[PDB]
Design an enzyme around this catalytic site. Sequence first.
Site, PDB file in Angstrom:
ATOM      1  N   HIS B 169      63.641   7.857   4.335  1.00 31.95           N
ATOM      2  CA  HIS B 169      63.158   8.238   5.651  1.00 31.95           C
ATOM      3  C   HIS B 169      63.819   7.590   6.859  1.00 31.95           C
ATOM      4  O   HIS B 169      63.217   7.428   7.945  1.00 31.95           O
ATOM      5  CB  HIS B 169      61.626   8.139   5.737  1.00 31.95           C
ATOM      6  N   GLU B 303      66.338  13.687   5.099  1.00 36.25           N
ATOM      7  CA  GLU B 303      65.654  13.331   3.877  1.00 36.25           C
ATOM      8  C   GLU B 303      66.112  14.247   2.773  1.00 36.25           C
ATOM      9  O   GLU B 303      65.699  15.400   2.721  1.00 36.25           O
ATOM     10  CB  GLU B 303      64.143  13.571   4.074  1.00 36.25           C
TER      11      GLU B 303
END
Lengths: 339, 346
Positions: B169, B303
């Site tokens: 992330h 991501e």
Amino acid sequence: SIKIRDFGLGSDLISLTNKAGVTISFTNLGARIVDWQKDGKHLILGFDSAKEYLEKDAYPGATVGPTAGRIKDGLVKISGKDYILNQNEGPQTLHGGEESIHTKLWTYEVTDLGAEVQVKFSLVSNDGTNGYPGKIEMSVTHSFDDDNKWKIHYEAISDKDTVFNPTGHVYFNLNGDASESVENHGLRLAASRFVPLKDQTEIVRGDIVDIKNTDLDFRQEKQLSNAFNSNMEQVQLVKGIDHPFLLDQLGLDKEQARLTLDDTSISVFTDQPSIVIFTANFGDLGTLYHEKKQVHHGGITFECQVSPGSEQIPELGDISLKAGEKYQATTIYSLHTKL
Amino acid sequence: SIKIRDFGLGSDLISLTNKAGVTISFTNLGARIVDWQKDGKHLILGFDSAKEYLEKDAYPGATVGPTAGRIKDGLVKISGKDYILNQNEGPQTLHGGEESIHTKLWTYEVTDLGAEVQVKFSLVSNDGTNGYPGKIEMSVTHSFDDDNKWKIHYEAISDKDTVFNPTGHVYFNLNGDASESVENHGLRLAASRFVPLKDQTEIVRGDIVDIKNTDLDFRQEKQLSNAFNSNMEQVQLVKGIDHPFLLDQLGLDKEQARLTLDDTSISVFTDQPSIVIFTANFGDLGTLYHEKKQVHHGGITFECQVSPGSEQIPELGDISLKAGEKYQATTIYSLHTKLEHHHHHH
Ligand SMILES: OC[C@H]1O[C@@H](O)[C@H](O)[C@@H](O)[C@@H]1O
Ligand SMILES: OC[C@H]1O[C@@H](O)[C@H](O)[C@@H](O)[C@@H]1O
Ligand code: NA
């Protein structure tokens, strides 16, 4: 004085020295006590790094839970419903199951209060972790003071009805060396009853037994040798002691137990109803502590908690924790030196 | 060179310096990237201590899982049976649920290989944690080399059949300041399709949309402002980008995406089939990053993982993990200078 250093695998070692020069240390791996020494002599058993605990025995000195002890068939009843907790000893759930709270790196914060220093460890048990409903926000505050008082204060709050009964798994050994049996220590314990085990599986047998006139009566101080030497079926069963003892008088003000060796003694206080005593009945295992091969009977615990087996003997207590209720537990180990 | 120190609350900061002088840092709190600097300029978003992650936002730079993204009603099907996972966003399971892996202190060991340094973080997800069958022994290895490659290598083995699809992330912001929008960055992305969301709950809508020649078409590099300014329905819905992009061609060897600002660029490689992009569409929230009030679109993620929504869109893939099978995933972010000629103004 406070000192923090790397203890291994990302774990920390927080070392506290009081005004008297006594040192005590804890690690966030398992919100655990690592050492306790006076005049360079160890009072408890411990290892030298994180790996040792993970590789050798992860229980010594640790905070164990969410439920301490053995739960028969891993079964607890919650809101009339059965729940199977993780099973790590045969069909039993021992000390919370595999890879429990004692193996996690807890977060922590140190609070220096002068005469007292506190180390507040925190950890969240997720809902469903090892079968336990939650989430459970837990904290274990280990404190050390100028009067040589080591206190353990537990707090917890769950989002869901669950079960909660943790304990401190420190092992004492006033010989300051694992290769030396604690047979030579004197033990005084304010309990007139004990909870016998059923068999080698160690689940509670179902009854409460009076210890008066048994080798397990420690109401009047006695040398542990006496118990080790006993022919008591219960003693032969475990090859020492591995049982819950029921306190006669509850409350934190009373000295529940006392362990003595020469001029050195450790007093035990708690707001819990029972003390589970385990005398390191390891036989030839020889686990190494500070390079010393551990001997059978080379240590002794004083696990203050609600007695294991309440699932079968309700009289022992109720470890239920309702959602939103604030769980608290306090246990104190006080060091004294005969002058 | 490697350095270690306390980062707060018991967490540590592992700091690496490669031969080129590029620095990068990680913390065991959530097997997370904390910083990446070039000539004193931050390349990503990050805080200064552990408490800030816990107090402000626990996701930035973290390892999220076991399942990255939104799972509708928290329901997954495992070996024929339905399982409800922890529901932390309305009835959805977002990023593995509450107080997940990004919030734990993983253990770690550093292996110094000279030209490359690896920081392997380990954690066990107990059986039943957040509803996930297990137990799952996970490891996340963050490594940095003299070639300016920051690699993330995931490994996992479950005792029981379960589901597993974690991601990294990290948020980039080549401006080195959160109060400066990434609208001025150029993005190239090797994806012709995206996954639209149903509504504000953000679960997948059910269909796969072709984005060629729209404001979400980055095959050919274009400024991020083109997407931010777009009035496309999906853009307005999330006030930016918060979507899975389907990679047109698979394999770690292909440069799947490239984010460029002036002479600096970040290239993205992965063995995963999609890249979920979130452009910090926080509006006026203003979370402080290094005392800088983060601006709307003050950051952008990449991501890499199996796209969220496979529960409704089987075509996206299958995140199941069979008991005893070794899961692996690899995502690489590589830093370069003067790869192309990015000279723009905003
Ligand atoms: O309390 C934990 C201890 O319980 C004993 O019954 C077991 O024999 C030990 O192996 C274990 O460490
Ligand atoms: O990926 C996690 C992010 O997802 C977005 O959809 C949310 O709006 C953010 O608050 C969150 O940090
Ligand atoms: Na540490």
